[PDB]
Design a protein around this ligand. Structure first.
Ligand SMILES: O=P(O)(O)O[C@@H]1[C@H](OP(=O)(O)O)[C@H](OP(=O)(O)O)[C@@H](O)[C@H](OP(=O)(O)O)[C@H]1OP(=O)(O)O
Ligand SMILES: O=P(O)(O)O[C@@H]1[C@H](OP(=O)(O)O)[C@H](OP(=O)(O)O)[C@@H](O)[C@H](OP(=O)(O)O)[C@H]1OP(=O)(O)O
Ligand SMILES: [Cl-]
Ligand SMILES: [Cl-]
Lengths: 313, 314
């Protein structure tokens, strides 16, 4: 008997050791667009050296022009309006803000904030319902109260920031709707592979989409969770493209590289090592799920298939 | 005709809702054996600080200092208070009081001294002492078994670094004082401003019933403004024959603030403090007058009552 299967390593961590303690500033609002903004229509750039890839390899762009997805970090309401306008130039279909954040977040006086616990794991272990209830309660409790909002600096701890008495509170759903985007939430934990529940939820949602839907994915930084769902969408929509091409091209338009690479973390971040290894293994397993289940139209969900076809370290 | 706020009460014009608490501030890092600015009335006088533009050649009278029996300091960890108590016990066989002058809610989380800090350290501004202590009791209790962020203030008087911990023990300063072998007395005085008539009436009633050999250890957060104000008050009350100049010079020269006139200079960001420094200078003078004019009948008239009939002038 195995306590936690591959793909579920985070279930072994204790939520009580990462409880939220500060309203973290998610974006300072200085730039017109959020960080790491990219779309599937973008030109491929040279790969980042840390992934030790072949800079001479040219991945297939088959299906990219029709993929219709984008990704970014968190944003201020003004930045999201800029994103929405930019994306409307590319499609006449519904544009979705696909919020991948498990952490409670929202807007206080229009400032994007999140209730941050160590490793951004303040809602670790909570069901999506419980995470969203926490978020609603916390945002409502901030109205007309004094809050401390701060960017994280040295040691991933607050440094500087501002103190204000809040006059307006909004959820991201409200901000997305104000920007003209549809909204869909998947509560995925920062830094780790999305859970079978997260992925089943995404696949059920994907199946409901009209042909011309545009998906704008984001979490906090626009790297791990954001690229994971962009990669899964590319695999689902372009199943004839090789795994190597999908991973190279999603990295080369500005995302994380989800293939094998020599992992090296700073000593203070050594806890991340096994989670990067787990993601590499799980990306391969998701590709296998798509290849094995697309012909019959996915009559068995990812969670069930993964239980009978466990991933191996 | 009607004056909204008299001299001595300027802080009543400030709006409490603009300075609400937002972080557990680290009050002392615990690295030294004693709290900062620790001094006693038995100490030798040192040269005055240049910023006060005093006469370095002046030799203040030490009349009554040997029997004064008071000390002052900044906030402290429990270990530091035990070291203070041991040092004071070498100087007296009477009861030693921890006279906590802090209006801000504070206490100890896992033995770490913290305070609920709002801008200007005014998180309990405008509250009665009853309300301030109720806030403190509730906040300390609510921290038990919960995760808290404790941080020192750095650039811009805002949190910088610090630590995050799940609290396993909570204590009030009263508990910490009793564990150190000291009696405890609380006066909820607001940081940076002249103590209120309510604060001073409370102190005078307390002073009147003290045993002859009581030793009073005063402290607030830094061991400067409120700490020195009450040390000066006590010196004046106990040694009424000593001149105002001697009291102010000597309390400054053993390590306290200088409460007489001086060239007030503030950084632009601290310009709000200017009028409060001026107010403290005139109120120190007014308190000296109260002591001189009310000692003969044994202070039958409370300070608050006397001050309303003899208001200070700006
Ligand atoms: O962008 P920075 O330099 O800050 O590093 C972030 C992570 O990106 P990577 O280092 O490429 O892994 C990013 O994704 P993960 O790979 O899944 O860890 C992670 O979301 C982001 O953390 P947050 O901003 O808290 O959301 C950065 O990681 P840390 O610096 O470990 O926090
Ligand atoms: O110790 P520093 O140099 O940092 O300044 C403290 C104040 O002392 P002074 O500047 O000497 O006036 C001190 O007393 P006040 O004169 O009554 O203002 C004041 O209590 C202390 O604030 P806290 O540590 O927050 O309690 C310092 O004042 P600020 O620097 O304005 O915060
Ligand atoms: Cl769930
Ligand atoms: Cl099934």
């Amino acid at each position: 008997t195995v306590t936690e299967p591959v793909g579920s390593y985070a279930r072994a961590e204790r939520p009580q050791d990462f409880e939220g303690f500060v309203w973290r500033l998610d974006n300072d609002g200085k730039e017109a667009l959020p960080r790491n903004f990219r779309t599937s229509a973008d030109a491929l750039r040279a790969p980042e050296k840390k992934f030790h890839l072949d800079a001479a390899y040219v991945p297939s762009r088959e299906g990219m022009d029709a993929l219709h997805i984008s990704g970014s970090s968190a944003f201020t309401p003004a930045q999201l309006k800029n994103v929405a306008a930019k994306l409307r130039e590319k499609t006449a279909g519904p544009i979705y803000d696909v919020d991948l954040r498990q952490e409670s977040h929202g807007y206080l006086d229009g400032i994007p904030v999140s209730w941050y616990g160590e490793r951004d794991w303040a809602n670790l272990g909570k069901s999506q319902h419980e995470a969203l209830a926490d978020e609603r309660h916390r945002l409502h409790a901030a109205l007309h109260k004094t809050v401390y909002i701060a960017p994280l600096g040295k040691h991933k701890l607050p440094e500087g920031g501002e103190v204000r008495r809040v006059q307006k509170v909004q959820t991201e759903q409200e901000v997305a709707e104000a920007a003209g985007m549809r909204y869909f939430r998947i509560a995925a934990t920062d830094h780790v592979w999305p859970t079978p529940e997260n992925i089943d939820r995404f696949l059920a949602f994907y199946r409901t989409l009209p042909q011309d839907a545009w998906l704008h994915f984001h979490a906090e930084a626009g790297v791990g969770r954001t690229t994971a769902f962009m990669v899964m969408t590319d695999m689902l929509k372009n199943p004839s493209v090789s795994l190597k091409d999908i991973l190279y091209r999603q990295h080369e338009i500005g995302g994380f590289y989800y293939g094998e690479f020599p992992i090296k973390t700073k000593d203070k971040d050594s806890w991340k090592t096994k989670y990067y290894r787990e993601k590499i293994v799980m990306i391969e397993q998701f590709y296998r799920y798509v290849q094995e289940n697309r012909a019959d139209g996915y009559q068995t969900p990812w969670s069930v298939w993964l239980k009978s076809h466990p991933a191996k370290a």
